[PDB]
Structure formats: structure tokens, C-alpha cells
Design a protein around this ligand. Structure first.
Ligand SMILES: [Mg+2]
Ligand SMILES: [Mg+2]
Ligand SMILES: [Mg+2]
Ligand SMILES: [Mg+2]
Ligand SMILES: [Mg+2]
Ligand SMILES: [Mg+2]
Ligand SMILES: [Mg+2]
Ligand SMILES: [Mg+2]
Ligand SMILES: [Mg+2]
Ligand SMILES: [Zn+2]
Ligand SMILES: [Zn+2]
Lengths: 167, 97, 131, 210
RNA sequence: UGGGAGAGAGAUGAAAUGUGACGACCCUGACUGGACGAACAGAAGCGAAAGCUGUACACUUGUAUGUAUUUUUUGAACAAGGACGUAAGCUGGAGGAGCGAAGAUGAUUAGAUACCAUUGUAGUUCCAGCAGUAAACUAUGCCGACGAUGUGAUAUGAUAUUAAUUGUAUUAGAUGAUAGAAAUUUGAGUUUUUUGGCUCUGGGGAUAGUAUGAUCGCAAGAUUGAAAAUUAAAGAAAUUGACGGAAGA
């Protein structure tokens, strides 16, 4: 059961999106149709390793049926890098995920015990089409963030909605 | 030293026997040096014995049973605890049916 | 009296450790009334042959078979057969209890596991399957 | 629903219904309903109804609750109106009673023969028997000699040829349902060695009747 | 290959490659090929050994039990010579369903060219011949005289009669007795109070079944078979502890 992270909205004057590999989610067992009532935060830094049976990124044991649930996080396949200049005249290498036509991939999830239902919102990093970078933006209640640059430049997001689809 | 009187199996005054095959692993074993069990199970469960009575179109009928014979090599047999290690003086007891 | 609204049908069940398949047909065996397998309702590959997914696979059978006018059902149970170990799976007793529970009467139960007179060479070497 | 739909690249209403008919030797000749699909008008469905086979219990035909072990299968050759007519071509015993009669420490004898009816058809029969316990109950070794298994097999050839020589199908089917063979073979075979549990297992048809 | 029906089937501790809308998998109706005789099936039978289970005929062959049948000492074991000999492996023709070394892919791993899984050739099947090795083990050469009770098994004769106990030849097991370093044991007994007859083999470990010569074989290889330089141990049966990614209460 291989899922993905895909953001779809109306985009203008952006070049890419970036985030931290951390997502709160609601999980559910596949032996019993039971929804875990509490949200669970998952990180790409927590490692659990056994030598010859399995390896995983997060671990869980069910309460109703005691079935094992293993979650693992992978990185994005289409990950590219562009140079950028700072305020002072120098060069710095940054990494980002390129926005395609009305779509953008972030990360790959995978699961061998249970399902994923809903993922919460992450404060993503926005890349400017005309070669600039801003650190941390949080999408508001309207699901639409707009910000104006000083020299009469504007970028915006319209109707930001997250989705998951198994492959 | 010698461990058992008959060495591995109960074969006397013969030269050879054709081999049979285990069900779990599938290695060849001679038919004398095998472990064979017999058990008879019914088609219906005892937990579902009363519930067929309300659904029967017939008045009275018999529930049928089937038999089975199994064969194993001795590596598979001791692993599934069909046959266990016994005492040295208690090895000579033979439980015929 | 045998109307088009009520008749007698035969049910085949093929249960192994990996999967259970429920196939119900008429008295001849040439036309399929309904056929729903246990793997079609489950989502994880480990749970195709579980007794949990079989009772889901038996209850949706009783819903569609009520539309096509079946009153009583005969039963044919079998295993894997051949060179495969032929023993009855876990989902055998689960399926026969759930169709009866919905209100359908049973006619006859028979055991049809095909047993060979002689075997062919099984999988595995002279020393066997060693895990 | 393990398979996602984007990963890999009502005819029940238009179906006609018919009735089955057994041969009229058994008092319950009605068996059940079948199905057939009519494609369009000016079509004859009689080609599809011939080649099928059905199988009915013996106890449902006889209307009796005593015996249920034997089983009969019939072949369709002709349609009248909404009815389908059958003829006897197959018989076999149930699998659970076949496995029950065999035992350890006891001699099993079996035989077979090909035989021809009054019409142009050839049949096969199978006969089994096991040995009986003597009142000399000291022996667990109730095995019989291999010389006497020849002699009991010769008597098995005689009664098969005598009971089913050239009699017609009405005498063929009723002689099997009444078990006339195994009881007569139990009296005759018991002279050399006492037997029990004599029965008929299966009846096979070799070639069809014109 | 003819009918019905329309999404997954199959494997694992858990999965992956591989596989299915040119329609599998399941239930049905007919066909063609190759291999093999389930359950009964045993501390039961036959064979010089390797070995030998579907039915009916044809040819051919053992050991044992009974007995006023012929002949009259023709016997046991064997250097030279001769025949048979599972499984692979070779040349020639027939065949090829399942299984499958070598080769190639998917996972595990520090590393796997190994265990796991998917494919895949020679082979294993038949006929005609070479080849001569196995833990070919009862690890116990062949012939001959005497031996303690109890429960069995195969064949067959006498007494006896529906109730038994008895003869000869093989064979399984238990308890004593002997012998043995001991485990064990109707011979592995009748032995320092050592002898009925006949063939073959061994002399502390390692070098080594290795070199060299000779005789066999289409080949692979088989039988026979040393030494120079080295070393104080190698080994068999059994008690007491310690350990087990060993099992029960
Ligand atoms: Mg041997
Ligand atoms: Mg047989
Ligand atoms: Mg004898
Ligand atoms: Mg000499
Ligand atoms: Mg010689
Ligand atoms: Mg030779
Ligand atoms: Mg040798
Ligand atoms: Mg030797
Ligand atoms: Mg010898
Ligand atoms: Zn659960
Ligand atoms: Zn095994």
C-alpha cells in the first residue's frame, strides 16, 4: 500500500515547494475496522532496526485486535537544486521540489499494517519563480495565502488542498 | 556406541524399501523410518451443531466424518512436538493401539 | 412445485490456508449465479485467508442470492487436492455458518476433495525445503 | 479490493427457465429448475440443453430416509416443451462410506468387469469386499492367503456376468438400488472364507447408445 | 477446444520480481500425451547379494514338511580363471508430463556468486553395449557337536474332535545365567585348567591411499602401492561438573 503526498491548487509566480519531513496523521487497522482516536506525529529521524526480520520508521500495536502496524517514510524522487544569490553578492546552493502543472509531490509513505486516513497541515517553504526564497509560511483558514514583494511583485496560492492516493 | 536395538527403524530380513515423501518439507524418507498418525474429524463443527437443526429441510439425518493419514520426516516431527525426547530407561515402552 | 421465485441450488467452497472462494450455481453446474472470493473484500495480503474476511465474504453472498430466488442450498466442500496437502482451511466452518444465519435452509453436505491414485514428484530436493 | 483501479490496464434478466425430468422408474421424477439464455427471436435453444449432466441423490428419488449412500447421474438427450428428459449413464458411491469400510489388520479384495446391456452400450462395474473376524479370537492376524484371493475373484466374475447379462435398463437400475449383487456375493463368497461389507463402488459407461 | 461470468489469482516468517480485460482464476462438455500403482501395508513373505506391490493368461524357479523310492561315498573351503552388481557418468538410435545440477534475476546481509522465491539446459523414461565405485552396515567370513524358562509369527504332520495339546525348519521380544575394559550379550559362551577343518586382513600417529612402474578402459578413472624429512601422543567405553540461540512440570 504505497501512498504519496500531492498538493493541488492554483499557482502563479512560484517555482517550487519544500517542507520538513514531519506529518501528523490518523491511522487505522486493517484486521479490525478501528480508528485510532488520537493523532500521531511521524518523523523521518526516528529509526527502529532489527537485523534479519524487518526494519521500519514507526511502530504500533493495536488495542482491539493487537495487529502490528509499521510505517515507513521515503524521500521524494524528483528532487532538484538551483543556485541562488543572497543580499550580499555570493552564491548558495538550495534544494527544493519542482512544481509541475497544477501539482506538486512532497514525499512517499508506505504501510504494512494499517491505512492512513487524513494528514494535517505543514508550514511549507515557498520558492519564488523570479529567484528568491522565503523560509516558513503557514496556510490560513481560507486555504489561500498571498504575499506581496516590495518591488511590486506578488505570488499567491488559491484553494490549497492536500490529498492522498494509493498506487 | 549403539543407541537403540533396532537401529533406526523396524526392518528385518529385507534389503530395501521404496521411499515416500514428507508433506511439510518434502524430503524423501523410507517407508519404515516414518512417523504416521491417524485422526478422524467431522465435516461440521460442534459449535455449529444446533444451528443446522433449525435450517434442516430433513427430519433426522446423520453428520458424516472423514479420515486422514499423515506422513513426516523426523526433523519435521520433533519440531512440531508430535514426538518428544524420553528418558533412557523409559525409551523401551511401546504404546500399541 | 418449483416456481421461478424459489428453487434449490448447489454451493461449492474451496478453502485453503491462503484463500477461500465461494461459488454458488444451479443444479447443472453450467451457469454462475454468484461468485465472490475472500480476497476481494480484504485490503492486506496477509489477511486473504483469515476467518475475519470470510464472514464478510459470506454475508454479501446472502444479499445477492436473495434477489435471484434461491430457497434451499446444497453444499460441496473440498480442499486444495492433488499434490497439495488437501487439508481443510480455516475459512470452511465460518462460511457455512453465516449463510445459514441469514435465513437460508440447507439441503445436503458432501466432501469432494480429489485424491490421486498416484503422485508425481513434489517440489523440493532430496534434502527438502530448508528454511 | 486489493487492486486499485488505475494501476492495471443485465444478462440474468433475459434468461428462460426449464424443468428437469428423471426416467419414470423412480416415483419422484421431478428434480429442479435450470436456466438458458435466449439471444434473440427465431433461435432454437435445444442444442444447449442436451449436453448437460445433473446428479440426484437416490434417497430423494425413492422418497426414503433409510439409505442415502448411492448416487445417480443422468444424461439429457431430448426436450419436450419446457421439460428435459434424462437417461441413466452414471453411478458412484459417496466418498465417506468408501473410506469407512477399509481397516488395518484386515484383508481387502476388489475386482471389476466390463459388461454389455441389451442395447448398444458397454458398462463397467466395481465390487469390493473385506474379511470378517473369526470366532477364533486369539488371532489379531485375520489375514487370508493369496491363493484364496484368486478363488474369490472368480466368483466375483460369475455373479457380475449373471446378474447383468442382457437385462434392460429398468432391470439394470432397480437391481442396483435394491443391492441384489453384494448380498448374493456374500453368501457365495463365504464358503471359502467368511466375508463382510460387500458392496458396489462405481458404475462406468464405456460407449454411448445409438 | 465448446458454454457461463468479468477482477485479481498464486507463494512466504513477512514480502518483492514474475503473472491477468488479445478475458486468467473458478464451475461445466469433450480430447491427446508422459510418469506412477494411494488407503490395506506389519519389527509379515521371497531372493546368492544389489532387490521385489493394479488385473487375466503364457513360459520359467526356490526352501521347508511327510514317506519300507534309485545310487553308493561322489564331502567343506579356495591361489589361477568366470558371472551378476542401487545410484550417478559415457558413446549410438526413440521420447520428453512433472522434477531439475550449470547459467541468469528479486529480497536478506558489512559482504553473499549460500539457505528463501521466480525461471531455466543436460539428465532421470525405452532398446542395444561399455563402466565396476558406496556408512554395498547385522560396521559381526564359511562348515560341524552340545545348551534355561515365558509370551508371539510363517509353513506343515500326528493325536483328537468343536475342545485342545503336540512333532520338524526358520524368526521377533522379555527375565535370569555366562563372557567382557564397558556399553551390552544364546553367542561376542564352552580360554592362561589356552588346539575339529579352510581362505583373507592389521602392527603408534601423520606424510598418504600421495608419488613411480606395470596391467585394464572411448574417456572419466579403477586394482596393486612406497620413501626422505617429522612427532609424545592419537584413540575406545564410562562417572562428576559447566554450557545450550534445547524440551517438559
Ligand atoms: Mg542397502
Ligand atoms: Mg493397490
Ligand atoms: Mg520357511
Ligand atoms: Mg594357498
Ligand atoms: Mg579372484
Ligand atoms: Mg557387466
Ligand atoms: Mg571401497
Ligand atoms: Mg566392510
Ligand atoms: Mg560380508
Ligand atoms: Zn486492529
Ligand atoms: Zn519433512
Amino acid at each position: 500500500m504505497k501512498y504519496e503526498l500531492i498538493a493541488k491548487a492554483d499557482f502563479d509566480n512560484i517555482k517550487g515547494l519544500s517542507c520538513d519531513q514531519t506529518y501528523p496523521a490518523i491511522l487505522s487497522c486493517t484486521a479490525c475496522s478501528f480508528v485510532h482516536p488520537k493523532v500521531v506525529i511521524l518523523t523521518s529521524e526516528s529509526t527502529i532496526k532489527e537485523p534479519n526480520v524487518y526494519k521500519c520508521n514507526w511502530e504500533m500495536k493495536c488495542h482491539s485486535c493487537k495487529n502490528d502496524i509499521k510505517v515507513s517514510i521515503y524521500k521524494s524522487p524528483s528532487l532538484s537544486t538551483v543556485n541562488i544569490k543572497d543580499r550580499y553578492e555570493d552564491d548558495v546552493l538550495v534544494s527544493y521540489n519542482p512544481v509541475n502543472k497544477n501539482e506538486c509531490l512532497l514525499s512517499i509513505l508506505e504501510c504494512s499494517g494499517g491505512e492512513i486516513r487524513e494528514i494535517k497541515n505543514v508550514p511549507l517553504n515557498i520558492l519564488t519563480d523570479d529567484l528568491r526564497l522565503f523560509n516558513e509560511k503557514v496556510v490560513d483558514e481560507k486555504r489561500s495565502l498571498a504575499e506581496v514583494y516590495g518591488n511590486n511583485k506578488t505570488y499567491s496560492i488559491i484553494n490549497y488542498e492536500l490529498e492522498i492516493r494509493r498506487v | 556406541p549403539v543407541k537403540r536395538k533396532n537401529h533406526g527403524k523396524n526392518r528385518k530380513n529385507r534389503g530395501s524399501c521404496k521411499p515416500v515423501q514428507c508433506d511439510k518439507c518434502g524430503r524423501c524418507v523410507p517407508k519404515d523410518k516414518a512417523i504416521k498418525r491417524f485422526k478422524i474429524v467431522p465435516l461440521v463443527e460442534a459449535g455449529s451443531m444446533d444451528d443446522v437443526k433449525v435450517a434442516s429441510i430433513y427430519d433426522i439425518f446423520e453428520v458424516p466424518r472423514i479420515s486422514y493419514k499423515n506422513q513426516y520426516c523426523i526433523s519435521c516431527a520433533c519440531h512440531a512436538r508430535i514426538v518428544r525426547v524420553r528418558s533412557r530407561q523409559g525409551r523401551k515402552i511401546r504404546y500399541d493401539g | 412445485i418449483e416456481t421461478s421465485n424459489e428453487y434449490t441450488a448447489i454451493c461449492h467452497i474451496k478453502a485453503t490456508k491462503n484463500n477461500t472462494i465461494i461459488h454458488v450455481t444451479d443444479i447443472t453446474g453450467s451457469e454462475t449465479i454468484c461468485r465472490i472470493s475472500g480476497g476481494m473484500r480484504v485490503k492486506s495480503k496477509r489477511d486473504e485467508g483469515s476467518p475475519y474476511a470470510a464472514m464478510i465474504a459470506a454475508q454479501d453472498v446472502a444479499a445477492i442470492i436473495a434477489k435471484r430466488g434461491v430457497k434451499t442450498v446444497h453444499f460441496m466442500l473440498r480442499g486444495a487436492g492433488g499434490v497439495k496437502p488437501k487439508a481443510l482451511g480455516a475459512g470452511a466452518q465460518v462460511a457455512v455458518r453465516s449463510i445459514i444465519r441469514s435465513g437460508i435452509k440447507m439441503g445436503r453436505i458432501e466432501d469432494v476433495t480429489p485424491e490421486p491414485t498416484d503422485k508425481v514428484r513434489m517440489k523440493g530436493g532430496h534434502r527438502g525445503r530448508r528454511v | 479490493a486489493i487492486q486499485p483501479p488505475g494501476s492495471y490496464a443485465d444478462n440474468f434478466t433475459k434468461k428462460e427457465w426449464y424443468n428437469l425430468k428423471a426416467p419414470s422408474v423412480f416415483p419422484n421424477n421431478v428434480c429442479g429448475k435450470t436456466m438458458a439464455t435466449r439471444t434473440s427471436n427465431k433461435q432454437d435453444l435445444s442444442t444447449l440443453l442436451i449436453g448437460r449432466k445433473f446428479e440426484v441423490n437416490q434417497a430423494d428419488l425413492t422418497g426414503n430416509l433409510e439409505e442415502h449412500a448411492r448416487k445417480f447421474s443422468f444424461r439429457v438427450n431430448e426436450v419436450r416443451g419446457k421439460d428435459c428428459i434424462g437417461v441413466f449413464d452414471g453411478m458412484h458411491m459417496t466418498s465417506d462410506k468408501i473410506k469407512g469400510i477399509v481397516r488395518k489388520w484386515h484383508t481387502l479384495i476388489e475386482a471389476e468387469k466390463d459388461i454389455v446391456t441389451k442395447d448398444g452400450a458397454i458398462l463397467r462395474v466395481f465390487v469390493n469386499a473385506v474379511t470378517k473376524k473369526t470366532p477364533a479370537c486369539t488371532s489379531k492376524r485375520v489375514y487370508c492367503k493369496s491363493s484364496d484371493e484368486k478363488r474369490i475373484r472368480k466368483v466375483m466374475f460369475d455373479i457380475i456376468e449373471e446378474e447383468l447379462k442382457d437385462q434392460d435398463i429398468s432391470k439394470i437400475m432397480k437391481k442396483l438400488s435394491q443391492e441384489v449383487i453384494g448380498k448374493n456375493i456374500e453368501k457365495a463368497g463365504s464358503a471359502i472364507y467368511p466375508l463382510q461389507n460387500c458392496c458396489v463402488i462405481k458404475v462406468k459407461t464405456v460407449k454411448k447408445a445409438r
